[PDB]
């Protein structure tokens, strides 16, 4: 299909290869093409990728696709007529298959078959009644399936995999004639008998037959009339069109069986061949678990009779059939499923079997090798035998019995003219020999000293006969002899190479004493006749041995090997990957002794090591694909361990670099010209465009012959750059000048600025800069300046036309763009590497200072001009092109997509449009695609460049001065003014987008880059001062006014909801306004400004400081108030009707007012200017005054050490005689203007204070402060903000404050309630006003009047109107603040001792009024206002602190509708809050005084007993949030008489808070009469309501996912969420409710027990069973299973898990005061009665569906889960329920839930349930698995006789209620005094005096199951079981012992099964039945139980002996019984 960028270059280069061959076929007529194909049977070269044949593939597809449509065989996913039963014509058979025939040959020996694409056409070639074509098609399909799972491929499902009209087709093709049969008078009639002269065909098959519901059949001799075509034609008519496929399958089979024609046997061969191929494909695609019975079950006699064909010779079987059978097993053995079975069927565990015998036969064949010598069949063998050996435990049984000594005789043959196999056999031996074990056996058979004597003969014979050497004919080669011999020698060399690395010493010695060393040289002698790979292995052999042996060199010195290598180094290298990456170590060896080292220093070795990178071919192969960097890393190693070579290496780098500039030739092009109009761009928005078909982008920088060189060389340099090395010296020998030369070529194309090379050098130059600072900075900046200056044509052209589109169509265009790409590259490199804020050094910016000082400000103007022209340039193209295309050529989608960065916002399609790329493109697009691409990056870089030197010291606070600082301000100024001139020009009308871009740029540069964690921006201060004082904000002020009128005049508009900035005149017309006002505000804010406090020690010639932040704030504030007032005077705002303003501009202006009245602390008279030019001792002094005599020190000395006020120059004292008569040159300068500009001019009048404090009053008494009520009706949304401005206004001035709220309310009553317009927002205004702290105290009279108003006229029907939520919100505030812990104050000599600080006041509402509200509140109906219900729940929850109110809530019916309101709205977000509040309310209901006391006592007692004087009161009380507020009185009472407060203090007045530990004296308390009253409460209908709602929701089709989810596969985090399908969340919510309530509150169970559908009455009506049954039986009744759907599975699993959770929690024990104790054991008198009912429900379900086999077929699903609940019950553990239970209380739980289970004998129950489970059923294993652990769980505990769902607990749920409302975690102060009334009064007085005073005066092997069950348990260990499972059986059997009554019988069962059972086939059954008869005790073998078609005695014995070993490995006492006399 397509590959990554770099690989495409290699593919294209290789495409040149096979140029003659590809042309040799394509440029030919089709008849020749077929004749050409029938010549390439064999392949004499290496593997050739399909990509080169791609055109051949397409030609074949076209050639045959026509035939496919000729017969309409082309099927469709829409049309389903299939095909008429006509088989493809005889003549075309060869034509159709021959082309396919070659396809198999190609696909076999080729590589990377992935890119094959014509696969889908094969299905269209399916549906072919003829078989031969079918056989070939399925054969190609088999090879393709190999491709699918050769290693791993299950992708491109739509191609052939997903298509479901193929899986069934191939399955039907399989299972046709199946395998051998069960004929009566015959064992099996193995298919192989078809050819022997013995048992005849099973005539049964010789009869036509077919039925579904149709049916047809005809006996043989009835098919002799109709032909195949006639048979098919007659049949089709009756049966459906969708049918006839099986008819085609079986009719031809019957016809073949109908006679004995000579071709008939060929037909049978064809059909069987197709069958094995189909089996291969089926196993290829289908998973083992399915095929286990999907196909194998239908045909069980498959593996048998398969190995019957692959042995050898057997001159009856078709060799083709043999090969096909070989192939299938190769596919099967890929996985670890059928391996062992294959071995057993073959016999690869005992010698003289099959495997180890056909090898003997092959050895016999090769020894003579004169007939029937096949090798394609042989290689597959060694392949397979390697395939088995991967499965580690399946080749130990191959090493044993003798394998190596059988292959070893296949090798060692001499004069073999069949050297093909030996390569594969050697490869197999290499693969097999891995461990330390087999190596020893190999040698001891004298294999070593066989290869090193075969290779010598091979090599010497190689040069003997030139009549050999028939090399390739269509390829690029380096050997030119013959491929096979090369492969053979390569394999032998590989094997020796591997074996050289075990012990060495022996191998080296054996190597010396042999004619191999002299033979090896012959290879290097002439590579023109051997090839290039061989030298790789030869040199590796040489390199490792010398390293292995240091003292072996001299022997190598002679024989001519080494001297030949050194004197020929530049005679071996070539374009091979491994070879090139192998040089560094080889030279690391030749220099292991001083002679070699000296020769290397001489002889020019190193120099040749480098170089060869200047030719494209050599540097390509490495391609820097992580291969090249290895070269660099290695090179350092050589120098790393050889210091003497340090010098020479660097010289190589220096020389190579200097030569590289040479080639660098302009090669291809920049752009193209349009096919018409001869223009490079467009002219009109409307125009016609042609289209082409290729990559949407050109993708240059590759195939250029220079980019590859740059990539490779830069990669090598980067690799060597790592760590350290000689690279640190290249700067020494070289100079920075030339280094730059290699980068920044003359003519780079557009994309050059995006490649690894630039990125790679981006890292290298950092390293050099990190050490050698003053190396490559000034020269780089010089190059930048020179390149900028070299551009003058368009850089100064007029700024009102398209320069590029002004000279289009002429060659001058290329010249223009050329330099642009180079400039882009230069900027890209410079911004990243040198100029960037992240990299700032105190020694760095000094370079900038010195550079600008010595050069000046020259590039600044050029940069500004470039920025102006660029943006301006990128508009006319937009304004003259078919805009639709603008999205096609959109440039942004390239690396560095950080939209943060000024220049791009014109999107003409929504951001989520998609890709929409490459939809339409042509030559015009490509030119435009580039022309814009450069400009974006150029502009982006320019802005960062502008910022970088706009911070200087302030970034690091370097504290400059003198020359350093002096320039700083000059850079600032020469930076600020430049940008203004851009804005001054470029008038508004005509070009708006430029205005937006420029404003964005200003906001960009003037704003500090993203800094701080969240602080968006700290506005630059000194730049702001320069901007203003030079004239700033007055440029915007005019733009603001123009646009303001430009918008208000617009034709009500709907702008509230908008996004996706576009060219709709409106949005642009306003888009500026947000940008402008935002920036304007940023200045005024006292926080979004950096502190640059100066003037002090900056301008010391004046008074005051006029701090540049606080003072600068003033003039801006003075400004813009005039425009506010002017607009107000006009009919603009704060007047009129309707809204004529954008929604956000109010938010903006409103914030300004808050700022405009934000006085911080300042009053100003005058401000002075920072005019560095005259700074401290100025520059003008040296310019003129202290010029003669240059008194630099003296003049400065006088100025500083004495009066610092330049008095000018005269000749009064200490002056030269010539000073006067020469100084007389001046009129006026720096005398009165010496002080910088104090104030030049302003906007209206004055700007330094005192314009404020007089302009405020005009507005203060003009508009909103008395006119909001008129405007507010027209702007309700922002009411949130209106108050803020009013509060700010009223802050500074006098304090009417609450008078405003009073005037409000006086307007509220007059609201004329009927109107839902003013009241709705007005109450919210009041509330937000009331929320404020300081305005609370003096508002009591207002709150009561509000209460009185609310009481009457409320009309509880008033719930369906907007003016309800906010009213209840204000009431919520009032109430919550009201009913705090009631106010309490202490007395009676409290002994304050630093008394408490006291607390503020509150307003406790009157008692009776609340009663009315509640009586007016709890009555509603048909609520449908979401927010209203949200408010109702919130208000109601607070009253539940009482009890009788809770009773009324229960018996109110409000919940009965508030619940269904949940289902009314489920797609909204805040349903979360709604459900949380409702759950808290419901949980609060059942709460009763009984539970509260126990839970509180548990909480406090735990606190004063743990250990993280303890428990500081001021800390615990703050963490008792969820506590106390529930019932402060009860918390006091329980905590009163305990904790015995200590620390009475010396005087008795407390000086501490922490109390004493748990009560030191304790107390006695009692309480009862609730033990029987814990339940009852007459069943408040809550539980019935919830259960009924769940029952209703159950049958609501909670399986179908929502109709559509749009781009669900384009999600963000994870799909398959259980949410959506609102019912699921609804049911999830209800299950949460139940699983919390039932386990939490005790009384809830009774209701869950006494369910019904009619709410029957009377005391304890009757314990029913309609709820447990529902949770077990009814739920999960949905019939589903429509194929595979993860959504369905996930939903089912979640709901089932929750169901199990609830049922398990049913029986759990509720947490209570039973904590922090020991427990022994007790039975809950009530719960226990519930326990038995719970279990009793389960046991009945077991008996049912067990008997009545039919009821045992449709109940396993229920049964599956069922047994699991028992496990999860005996375990006190549930999927989610882990933190809702009392852990220390789980002791008795297991005890009781084991004893009760034993009473009914559930173990005894299960085994009976386990019995009767027939093994033949597929679920057999499944259901056996679940129970076995259950018994183990029961026994294990018995040893003691002596997705993202969140759930919480009781104490935890209170915290949510505490924090949702009032949050301040200090309200305990409301009760802190209260506890004091008894905290110490009688605690630290009575106990202390009574104690302290007087103290100082004196100072079972029980039967666990039955005798017929364990026998039934022995029904185990018979099914064909895998490993791991056996573990649990061992644990059970070992633990099940100690039952003395069973220990005797347990084993006695087995020994019998051994002695009598495993003797033959007809013995096992006669004990399997007996053990069965011992399970369902009745008679003795009154009926036969069939065996499960498996379990041969070997398997039973295997499992049985395994288990026997297991048992005897555990029981110290078992051995004794093992050896004895039974005593009968």
Author numbering: 2 to 213, 236 to 1074, 1076 to 1532, 1539 to 1872, 2220 to 2276, 2450 to 2574
Paper text:
We performed single-particle cryo-EM reconstructions of two Tom1p constructs: full-length Tom1p that contained a 20-residue tag including 12 histidines inserted between residues K1074-D1075 (Tom1p^His^; physiologically active in all phenotype assays) and Tom1p^ΔAD^ with the C-terminal Protein A described for intact Tom1p above ([Fig fig2], presumably inactive). These structures were determined at resolutions of 3.97 Å (Tom1p^His^) and 3.07 Å (Tom1p^ΔAD^) for the dominant closed ring conformations ([Fig fig6], 7C, S6). The two maps and structural models were very similar to each other, indicating that neither the internal affinity tag, the absence of the acidic domain, or the presence of a C-terminal Protein A scar induced notable conformational changes. As expected, the acidic domain was disordered in the Tom1p^His^ structure. The structure of Tom1p^His^ is very similar, with the exception of more poorly resolved density at the UBM domain. The Neck is followed by the Body domain (residues 507-2,888), which comprises a helical repeat solenoid structure that forms a ring architecture and leads into the C-terminal HECT domain. The first helix of the HECT domain, residues 2889-2906, helps to close the ring by packing between the HECT N- and C-lobes on one side and the Head and Neck domains on the other side. The Head domain largely closes one side of the ring formed by the Body domain to create a basket-shaped structure, while the HECT domain is positioned to one side at the opposite, open face of the basket. Mutation of two residues in the Head domain at the solenoid closure interface reduced human HUWE1 E3-ligase activity, suggesting that the closed conformation is important for the catalytic cycle.
